[PDB]
Design an enzyme around this catalytic site. Structure first.
Site, PDB file in Angstrom:
ATOM      1  N   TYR A  45     -41.164  12.305  21.820  1.00 21.81           N
ATOM      2  CA  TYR A  45     -40.129  11.307  21.981  1.00 21.81           C
ATOM      3  C   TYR A  45     -40.248  10.205  20.964  1.00 21.81           C
ATOM      4  O   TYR A  45     -41.302   9.954  20.365  1.00 21.81           O
ATOM      5  CB  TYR A  45     -40.178  10.673  23.376  1.00 21.81           C
ATOM      6  CG  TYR A  45     -41.356   9.747  23.598  1.00 21.81           C
ATOM      7  CD1 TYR A  45     -41.245   8.371  23.488  1.00 21.81           C
ATOM      8  CD2 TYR A  45     -42.606  10.264  23.913  1.00 21.81           C
ATOM      9  CE1 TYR A  45     -42.347   7.541  23.684  1.00 21.81           C
ATOM     10  CE2 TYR A  45     -43.702   9.437  24.118  1.00 21.81           C
ATOM     11  CZ  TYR A  45     -43.579   8.088  24.001  1.00 21.81           C
ATOM     12  OH  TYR A  45     -44.697   7.313  24.233  1.00 21.81           O
ATOM     13  N   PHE A  55     -39.961   1.164  19.195  1.00 23.65           N
ATOM     14  CA  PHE A  55     -41.113   0.651  19.915  1.00 23.65           C
ATOM     15  C   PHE A  55     -42.174   1.694  20.221  1.00 23.65           C
ATOM     16  O   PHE A  55     -43.286   1.317  20.594  1.00 23.65           O
ATOM     17  CB  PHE A  55     -40.703  -0.107  21.184  1.00 23.65           C
ATOM     18  CG  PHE A  55     -40.052   0.735  22.221  1.00 23.65           C
ATOM     19  CD1 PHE A  55     -40.791   1.456  23.139  1.00 23.65           C
ATOM     20  CD2 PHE A  55     -38.678   0.812  22.289  1.00 23.65           C
ATOM     21  CE1 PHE A  55     -40.151   2.253  24.080  1.00 23.65           C
ATOM     22  CE2 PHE A  55     -38.045   1.585  23.243  1.00 23.65           C
ATOM     23  CZ  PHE A  55     -38.789   2.300  24.140  1.00 23.65           C
ATOM     24  N   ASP A  56     -41.875   2.983  20.058  1.00 22.57           N
ATOM     25  CA  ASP A  56     -42.879   4.001  20.335  1.00 22.57           C
ATOM     26  C   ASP A  56     -42.419   5.333  19.777  1.00 22.57           C
ATOM     27  O   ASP A  56     -41.224   5.580  19.615  1.00 22.57           O
ATOM     28  CB  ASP A  56     -43.093   4.111  21.859  1.00 22.57           C
ATOM     29  CG  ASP A  56     -44.394   4.756  22.245  1.00 22.57           C
ATOM     30  OD1 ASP A  56     -45.216   5.064  21.385  1.00 22.57           O
ATOM     31  OD2 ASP A  56     -44.596   4.930  23.451  1.00 22.57           O
ATOM     32  N   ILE A  75     -41.047   5.788  33.687  1.00 23.01           N
ATOM     33  CA  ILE A  75     -39.864   5.087  34.142  1.00 23.01           C
ATOM     34  C   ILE A  75     -38.884   6.053  34.815  1.00 23.01           C
ATOM     35  O   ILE A  75     -38.832   7.258  34.528  1.00 23.01           O
ATOM     36  CB  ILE A  75     -39.180   4.287  33.011  1.00 23.01           C
ATOM     37  CG1 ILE A  75     -38.779   5.180  31.831  1.00 23.01           C
ATOM     38  CG2 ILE A  75     -40.064   3.125  32.581  1.00 23.01           C
ATOM     39  CD1 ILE A  75     -37.914   4.473  30.809  1.00 23.01           C
ATOM     40  N   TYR A 101     -37.796  -0.852  32.627  1.00 18.08           N
ATOM     41  CA  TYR A 101     -38.800  -1.872  32.915  1.00 18.08           C
ATOM     42  C   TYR A 101     -38.221  -3.119  33.562  1.00 18.08           C
ATOM     43  O   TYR A 101     -38.954  -4.097  33.799  1.00 18.08           O
ATOM     44  CB  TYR A 101     -39.616  -2.216  31.662  1.00 18.08           C
ATOM     45  CG  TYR A 101     -40.433  -1.059  31.202  1.00 18.08           C
ATOM     46  CD1 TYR A 101     -41.679  -0.812  31.755  1.00 18.08           C
ATOM     47  CD2 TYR A 101     -39.951  -0.181  30.253  1.00 18.08           C
ATOM     48  CE1 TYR A 101     -42.439   0.267  31.344  1.00 18.08           C
ATOM     49  CE2 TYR A 101     -40.712   0.905  29.840  1.00 18.08           C
ATOM     50  CZ  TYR A 101     -41.947   1.121  30.410  1.00 18.08           C
ATOM     51  OH  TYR A 101     -42.721   2.188  30.047  1.00 18.08           O
ATOM     52  N   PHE A 118     -33.818   6.595  24.005  1.00 21.76           N
ATOM     53  CA  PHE A 118     -34.825   7.586  23.682  1.00 21.76           C
ATOM     54  C   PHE A 118     -34.206   8.843  23.114  1.00 21.76           C
ATOM     55  O   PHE A 118     -33.140   9.286  23.569  1.00 21.76           O
ATOM     56  CB  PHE A 118     -35.620   8.020  24.919  1.00 21.76           C
ATOM     57  CG  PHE A 118     -36.477   6.950  25.510  1.00 21.76           C
ATOM     58  CD1 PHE A 118     -37.785   6.751  25.073  1.00 21.76           C
ATOM     59  CD2 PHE A 118     -35.999   6.160  26.545  1.00 21.76           C
ATOM     60  CE1 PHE A 118     -38.588   5.763  25.650  1.00 21.76           C
ATOM     61  CE2 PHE A 118     -36.810   5.178  27.119  1.00 21.76           C
ATOM     62  CZ  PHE A 118     -38.100   4.997  26.660  1.00 21.76           C
TER      63      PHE A 118
HETATM   64  C1  LIG Z   1     -42.682   4.547  38.216  1.00 22.60           C
HETATM   65  O1  LIG Z   1     -42.425   3.341  37.495  1.00 22.60           O
HETATM   66  C2  LIG Z   1     -43.078   3.292  36.294  1.00 22.60           C
HETATM   67  C3  LIG Z   1     -44.013   4.226  35.857  1.00 22.60           C
HETATM   68  C4  LIG Z   1     -44.623   4.082  34.608  1.00 22.60           C
HETATM   69  C5  LIG Z   1     -44.300   2.996  33.797  1.00 22.60           C
HETATM   70  O2  LIG Z   1     -44.854   2.796  32.558  1.00 22.60           O
HETATM   71  C6  LIG Z   1     -45.943   3.600  32.159  1.00 22.60           C
HETATM   72  C7  LIG Z   1     -45.372   4.931  31.659  1.00 22.60           C
HETATM   73  N1  LIG Z   1     -44.629   4.862  30.359  1.00 22.60           N
HETATM   74  C8  LIG Z   1     -45.346   4.531  29.131  1.00 22.60           C
HETATM   75  C9  LIG Z   1     -45.368   5.771  28.230  1.00 22.60           C
HETATM   76  C10 LIG Z   1     -44.027   5.806  27.464  1.00 22.60           C
HETATM   77  C11 LIG Z   1     -43.444   7.218  27.447  1.00 22.60           C
HETATM   78  C12 LIG Z   1     -42.909   7.561  28.827  1.00 22.60           C
HETATM   79  C13 LIG Z   1     -41.816   6.585  29.212  1.00 22.60           C
HETATM   80  C14 LIG Z   1     -42.419   5.192  29.315  1.00 22.60           C
HETATM   81  C15 LIG Z   1     -43.309   5.144  30.409  1.00 22.60           C
HETATM   82  O3  LIG Z   1     -42.843   5.373  31.521  1.00 22.60           O
HETATM   83  N2  LIG Z   1     -43.123   4.780  28.068  1.00 22.60           N
HETATM   84  S1  LIG Z   1     -42.149   3.962  26.921  1.00 22.60           S
HETATM   85  O4  LIG Z   1     -41.817   4.876  25.769  1.00 22.60           O
HETATM   86  O5  LIG Z   1     -40.958   3.377  27.625  1.00 22.60           O
HETATM   87  C16 LIG Z   1     -43.136   2.679  26.259  1.00 22.60           C
HETATM   88  C17 LIG Z   1     -43.856   2.958  25.132  1.00 22.60           C
HETATM   89  C18 LIG Z   1     -44.667   2.003  24.542  1.00 22.60           C
HETATM   90  C19 LIG Z   1     -44.750   0.787  25.064  1.00 22.60           C
HETATM   91  N3  LIG Z   1     -45.485  -0.245  24.602  1.00 22.60           N
HETATM   92  C20 LIG Z   1     -45.356  -1.339  25.347  1.00 22.60           C
HETATM   93  O6  LIG Z   1     -45.918  -2.410  25.147  1.00 22.60           O
HETATM   94  S2  LIG Z   1     -44.381  -1.064  26.528  1.00 22.60           S
HETATM   95  C21 LIG Z   1     -44.039   0.495  26.174  1.00 22.60           C
HETATM   96  C22 LIG Z   1     -43.247   1.398  26.778  1.00 22.60           C
HETATM   97  C23 LIG Z   1     -43.369   2.069  34.249  1.00 22.60           C
HETATM   98  C24 LIG Z   1     -42.763   2.215  35.485  1.00 22.60           C
HETATM   99  O7  LIG Z   1     -41.846   1.337  35.972  1.00 22.60           O
HETATM  100  C25 LIG Z   1     -41.642   0.233  35.086  1.00 22.60           C
END
Ligand SMILES: COc1ccc(OCCN2CC[C@H]3CCC[C@@H](C2=O)N3S(=O)(=O)c2ccc3[nH]c(=O)sc3c2)cc1OC
Length: 128
Positions: A45, A55-56, A75, A101, A118
């Site tokens: 992704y 951002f990622d 998420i 978020y 995404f």
């Molecule tokens: C059940 O509810 C949740 C569960 C887990 C959650 O977050 C942890 C899982 N997670 C992170 C992994 C990644 C890919 C998968 C999607 C998403 C992600 O879910 N992120 S992401 O690309 O959006 C992304 C990347 C880098 C990055 N850097 C930052 O400082 S912030 C950030 C955000 C949040 C939930 O509700 C708020």
């Protein structure tokens, strides 16, 4: 660009039909089967903010992102969106903050109340 296009031309895939998660299939995947709840799913992704900033990216890490589907390990938009994908599919997802978020954001990269874009490729899925 692609974020505008999914915003304006995407399909609402939410059960509530509140347009919180919009999708466009970019590359059609294989067969008809989608993953099931609890499957280990492997994705590549990239994510962008609504200000255009990447951002990622898993591609930049040279390894896929792996999670168990439908367990809130990601998420809400991802649990919903990846559940619709076939193996080999690439899609675009446009995720309102209520399916991402929320008001909290996620430091350091994601602000409060952020709509996220995404591109996701479903590499594989398997039951454990
Ligand atoms: C059940 O509810 C949740 C569960 C887990 C959650 O977050 C942890 C899982 N997670 C992170 C992994 C990644 C890919 C998968 C999607 C998403 C992600 O879910 N992120 S992401 O690309 O959006 C992304 C990347 C880098 C990055 N850097 C930052 O400082 S912030 C950030 C955000 C949040 C939930 O509700 C708020």
């Amino acid at each position: 660009g692609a974020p505008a296009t999914v915003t304006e031309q995407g399909e609402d895939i939410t059960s509530k039909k509140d347009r919180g998660v919009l999708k466009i299939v970019k590359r059609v995947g294989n067969g008809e089967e989608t993953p099931m709840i609890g499957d280990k799913v492997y994705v590549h992704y990239k994510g962008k903010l609504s200000n255009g900033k990447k951002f990622d990216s898993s591609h930049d890490r040279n390894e896929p992102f792996v999670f168990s589907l439908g367990k809130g390990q990601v998420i809400k938009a991802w649990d919903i969106g990846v559940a619709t994908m076939k193996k080999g599919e690439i899609c675009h997802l446009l995720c309102k903050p209520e399916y991402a978020y929320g008001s909290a954001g996620s430091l350091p990269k994601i602000p409060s109340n952020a709509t996220l874009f995404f591109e996701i490729e479903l590499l594989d899925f398997k039951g454990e």
